[PDB]
Symmetry: C5
């Protein structure tokens, strides 16, 4: 197969509305945020404006092809794929996608989607101007798929962080959690990302 044949097959049999569950087991979605910049912090309102790469991986076996004498991977527009309906539960702006909306599909059906996102959050900005810094927690999970349909798992903290930010990263921790909504008995899995950061140049003058 060549790239043209693989992309044709995906475009033609793309069920983007259909979650690719295998034998009624959940789709395992891995999520890791790589922080690139912290642009605005407001200690009065407890709001932060951040740029991050949202590394997202899952399997969709309906995409798979025989890689013998074929590409091992192709770039696919996400409009041609099912993508997990992830939301940041404490976002106060829509995610602004800064990058081309293409995912990488591996011949075994693994999908890697990593948009660069600018987004504003409600989180704890207290201590940003101190040595120990602020800890802003961001919670990401499926909006509509509970734990029997989607599982969410986490996958240098400053490796891609801008050296030119007014802020610096002290630590990033990413832990699995579970939330319940009042309407409904099912739990939703989430990743809770704790961004420990502080303002550069905190000497009193």
């Amino acid at each position: 197969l060549d790239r043209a044949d693989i992309l044709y097959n995906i475009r033609q049999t793309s069920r983007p509305d259909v979650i690719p569950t295998q034998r009624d087991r959940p789709v395992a979605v891995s999520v890791s945020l790589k922080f690139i910049n912290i642009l605005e912090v407001n200690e009065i309102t407890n709001e932060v404006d951040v740029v991050f790469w949202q590394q997202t991986t899952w399997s969709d076996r309906t995409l798979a092809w025989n890689s013998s004498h074929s590409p091992d991977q192709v770039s696919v527009p996400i409009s041609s794929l099912w993508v997990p309906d992830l939301a940041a539960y404490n976002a106060i702006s829509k995610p602004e996608v800064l990058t081309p909306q293409l995912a990488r599909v591996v011949s075994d059906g693994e999908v890697l989607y990593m948009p660069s996102i600018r987004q504003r959050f409600s989180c704890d900005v207290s201590g940003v101007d101190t040595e120990s810094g602020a800890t802003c927690r961001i919670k990401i999970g499926s909006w509509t798929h509970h734990s029997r349909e989607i599982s969410v798992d986490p996958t240098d903290d400053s490796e891609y962080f801008s050296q030119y930010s007014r802020f610096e990263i002290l630590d990033v921790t990413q832990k699995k959690n579970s939330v319940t909504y009042s309407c409904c008995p099912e739990a939703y899995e989430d990743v809770e990302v704790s961004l420990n950061f502080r303002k550069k140049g905190r000497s009193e003058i």
Copy 2:
């Protein structure tokens, strides 16, 4: 049936433009706001910028399937479903939907749609910096379907509200009302949501 068959059937037959009235009774729509954040308040202009989850449920029997050896629920893009034409009558900004535009459909045709919305309102902000706080009333009902076509029913306070807001919720009440427009004799049902909130000390 599997998910692929159910979603195919819904996409092919759901009639998103067709209100799913049964035997000329109104469609019963339930609406409840869960307040998540209060972002900006202006006591001079009487404007508030709020984030809320708009829990919306109704029945559409045209979506129903036999759940024997089948999923009991599916996630469906709202572009493939009829959705009630709800509007906040005192909104001064378009609703900004922060979440994926998917609804949950149950095999009996019950639909659950709960977008996270950021929206600005004209309401009473007087007393926000006092112990008793401000009471901002938000009115939500059908833009085009009167009470013979859509009924709106409300059916805890602070449960999902951000601990990091500058504001705190003292009380939320959600009560059924009716409005009439000058053009037309028919009443439109609404839910009136009273948000009692104050600036934290």
Copy 3:
């Protein structure tokens, strides 16, 4: 007929690009603004930010059905209908439509479309802080259809009936009058409704 049949017929025979003229008479479009809020006023720049319901009615006989044992009215997405190409000639922002983009269609082909719009205008804000107030004129007409294709008419109810009690401003008077403009370029006249909003800052 049921709602499903009527909406199917409209969706299938919808010519949304085709003005529904009858026997080469103009389409009579009625426009009435119901002011809901005055949000920002700048007396230096002569700019106002207003929210209004734009009550818009016209006839499209291609939509009509026999109402015997049928609904008298249905809700239709405006993407399935011809709608008049109305513009506010002194708007300085795009109209922000706050409401679901549905119209009501009556079995005789009458259409009622009433979006809630937030929009900014260039108009006379002088006198806003006085007892007699400011008079801001908003002109709304067809962008491309002259008077032989579209006529715009005010309708024949309290000016403040839907106006927010929480606005910093109050309405003293609203008048809505028919106006015609003829440009040097072109022989044809373009109709508008001129809406005069007399308002002031509350004491």
Copy 4:
């Protein structure tokens, strides 16, 4: 023919990606800006926010019909027409179109497209608070078509300016410019609009 038949024919045989050149002559595009408002001026940054009607006309003979017992003109959505790929070379914001995106098509194939646009420009704002005023020059041309494919020609310009603006128009001049760049052998046309305005 009636309006329904003409609009059907246009929608069905619309090649909106195909420039309507006749016998390898350029498409003659006329552009005139009618200034409506000057909203924000910054003399420090040399930026202005303006509202104008962009009167745009050209011929597309593929649209033409016999006007005997037929309308002389119809309103057509611009998504059903070829439109010139005009850009304002000194714009610093996307054009905000304030009006319905319809053009008028005449039975001889003339197209009249006149959007109301709000747009921000980088131009000379120096002297805005003086008697002689500022002169802000706006250059509009085809982004991808050289002079053998599109010619741009100027066609009152101040007549419909808002009496309520903080600013007033002293003069508008609109001239043709033809530019050959070092990169490329072909000439590109533009219209250069000089807006002489001042604070009242």
Copy 5:
């Protein structure tokens, strides 16, 4: 062939989702920024708002036609073409495209795409108010195609198209080839690093 036939052929067959690799060589993409304006600079936050022409060229032989008694070039909407998935790795805003989204296609399959973009960047603004000025580095490369699929190469006066009305002036522009690696994957991504040396006029 006339323009209508060429544009019909491209619209029917161009495969915009398909990278036009020849015999498993990478697609050679040339990228050069022409700076038009510097609109806002913040020395505290190290942010700049810039307008530039992103001159972008590559070959797609699936677009080619016989130019005998035919146009040598046509204008094509980029929705009908494969375009490289270029991103500015240090952008902090979406690219605002100010121009019609059309490319020029030459009869040999060369594509020339040059959008005018307004975009905000995180870069070194230190020294902007000094004689030596600031040097702001912008890195542009493929978001999803590594060096075996896309190669990036740089291709007049640095101020030739720069606005005389900017508060800033350009001292120098240099454009060099580099490579980046991401943690997920062993493969390198080629980029152009554009160094904009500029200062405040006043």
